[PDB]
Amino acid sequence: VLVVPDTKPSGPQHTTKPSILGAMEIGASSNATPESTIETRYVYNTNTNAEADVEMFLGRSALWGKVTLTRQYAKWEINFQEQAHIRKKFEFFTYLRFDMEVTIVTNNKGLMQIMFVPPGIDHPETHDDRKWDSASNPSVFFQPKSGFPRFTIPFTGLASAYYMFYDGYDKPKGSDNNEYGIAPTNDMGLLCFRTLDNSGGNDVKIYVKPKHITAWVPRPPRATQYTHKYSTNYHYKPNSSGPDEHVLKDRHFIKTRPLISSA
C-alpha cells in the first residue's frame, strides 16, 4: 500500500523564484504544498488512498437491475445504464475493462433457473418455452433459500475495453436508423429468469461487482440526473399533459447562496 508523503519542515524563506505564482493557462495543476506557503513542521503521515483506487472505488457490487417475475418469468439485458448511482461512477472514465461477478438476490422460494443467453441468438420468452432446454447456453439452477447464486462473467469486449462513451455511429452517413453512443458497441448478454415452483415473491435483484478493472480516460463526473439510458441526454420532460408541454428541467446539483463574500 502507498502512504501519502510526510510533511517536511520548512522555515522562513526569501526567494526570488516564487513557487506560489504560476499560470492557470498552461493546463497544469499546482505543485504547491504547505511547505511553499507557510512555515511547517515535520509530520509523520501514515494515511493511505488505498480505498480510492479504481479497484476499491468501483469494486463494491452495486445493484445494476431489478426485474419482476410476471408469469414466473423474467428477462434482463445486462447493463449499468439503468441505475444512476453506479452509472455515474463508471462514467468517471471513458473506457473500462473489467470482469464482473453477478450475484442474484431474489425473494422468491422454491427453485429458479437463470439462463445466460450469449448475444446473437434467441432467448426463452416464457417459462415452459422449449428454449429453456439448451445444450450450450450456460444456466444456473439454485434454490433461493440457503444461498445466493453468484457467477463471474469475464471481459467480453470485441475491443480492449468497454466504451462508457462513444462519439460514433454503427452505420454510415446516409442510413436513417443510425444509433449513437455505446449501445451498438457491445452487448454483454441477457439473463433470463424463471421459477420452477410458485412459492415466494416475484422480485429479482441483480447485483454486479466489477473486478480486475482497468480504467482509462477520466471524465467530468455527471453533473445532472440521467433521463434516458444510453443517451447522455440531461434535459428532463416532466409532463406530457398540457401547457407545461415542451418545458424541460436540467435537474443539476448546484445550489445557490445569498451572497458571495458573505458565506
Binding site: A135, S136, S139, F141, G147, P149, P172
Partner: protein, 235 residues
C-alpha cells in the same frame, strides 16, 4: 471444527461449472480403448475443412443439389455474378462446416478461405475478378469499385480452382457471428475479368464455391446454435 464460510455461489448448480462428482458403479472397468482412425480433438478442425457454399440458394433451387452451383456464360460487358455477404449467420456460410461450427460461438476472429471451382468442358476459358469489400464499405455494384478492395484475378484452365483469402480486417478484435452493422464483415463478389468463353456460342459453365477457416481463425463464447430447433418431442 475448522471455521469455514459459504460464499454466494457455493450451493449453486451452474450448468457450465467444472467439478468432481461421486462415482456410481465403483470398481467398474471400462472397455479398453483401441485405436480408431479419425480422432478429432477440436471442433475448429471441422471449420478448417472446405465445404460447399449454397451459393445458388433461391426460390426454386433450395432443396436441390443445384443450389450449390451458378451458371456463367459469355457476355459483352462485365456483370456482378455472385455476392457472398460475409456473415457467419447468413445461410450461405451458416450451413457449411465453417459456418455451422461458428454458429455455436457468439463472435469470431481470423481469415476466411473461399475457393471457386468452375465445372465446364476443357475448351472453356475465363478470367474472373473475386473481390472482398472490407468492412464499412458499400457493396460495389461496379467492377471499378470492386477492384479497389482485396481482390484476386483467377485465370481458368488446367487447374480447376482458385482461392481468395478473405483477410482479417476489423476495427475490434472480434466479429459477431450474427450480422450487425457495427461488426459487419464486408462482401465477397464475383465479376467477369474478361469473359467466360466456351467453345460454342451458346455454351455455359458452372461455378461452385467452398469455404474454410484459415489457421488464425478463433471463436469464443459457446452458445446455442440457431441451426437447430425442436418444436416437437422425440418419441
Amino acid at each position: 471444527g475448522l471455521p469455514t464460510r459459504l460464499p454466494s455461489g457455493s450451493q449453486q448448480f451452474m450448468t457450465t461449472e467444472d467439478e468432481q462428482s461421486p462415482n456410481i458403479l465403483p470398481g467398474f472397468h471400462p472397455s479398453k480403448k483401441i485405436h480408431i482412425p479419425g480422432m478429432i480433438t477440436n471442433v475448429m478442425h471441422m471449420a478448417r475443412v472446405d465445404s460447399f457454399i449454397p451459393i445458388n440458394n433461391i426460390q426454386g433451387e433450395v432443396g436441390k443439389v443445384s443450389m450449390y452451383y451458378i451458371t456463367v456464360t459469355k457476355k459483352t460487358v462485365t456483370e456482378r455474378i455472385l455476392v457472398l455477404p460475409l456473415e457467419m449467420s447468413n445461410t450461405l456460410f451458416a450451413t457449411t462446416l465453417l459456418g455451422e461450427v461458428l454458429n455455436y460461438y457468439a463472435n469470431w476472429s481470423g481469415s476466411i478461405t473461399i475457393t471457386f471451382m468452375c465445372v465446364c468442358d476443357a475448351f472453356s476459358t475465363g478470367k474472373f475478378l473475386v473481390a472482398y469489400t472490407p468492412p464499412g464499405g458499400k457493396l460495389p455494384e461496379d467492377r471499378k469499385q470492386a477492384m479497389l478492395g482485396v481482390h484476386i484475378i483467377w485465370d481458368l484452365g488446367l487447374q480447376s480452382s482458385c482461392t481468395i483469402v478473405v483477410p482479417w480486417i476489423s476495427s475490434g478484435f472480434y466479429r459477431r457471428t450474427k450480422a450487425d452493422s457495427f461488426t459487419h464483415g464486408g462482401y465477397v463478389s464475383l465479376w467477369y475479368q474478361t469473359a467466360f468463353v466456351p467453345p460454342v456460342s451458346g455454351g455455359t459453365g458452372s461455378i461452385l464455391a467452398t469455404c474454410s477457416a484459415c489457421p488464425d481463425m478463433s471463436v469464443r463464447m459457446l452458445r446455442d446454435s440457431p441451426m437447430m430447433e425442436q418444436k416437437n418431442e422425440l418419441q
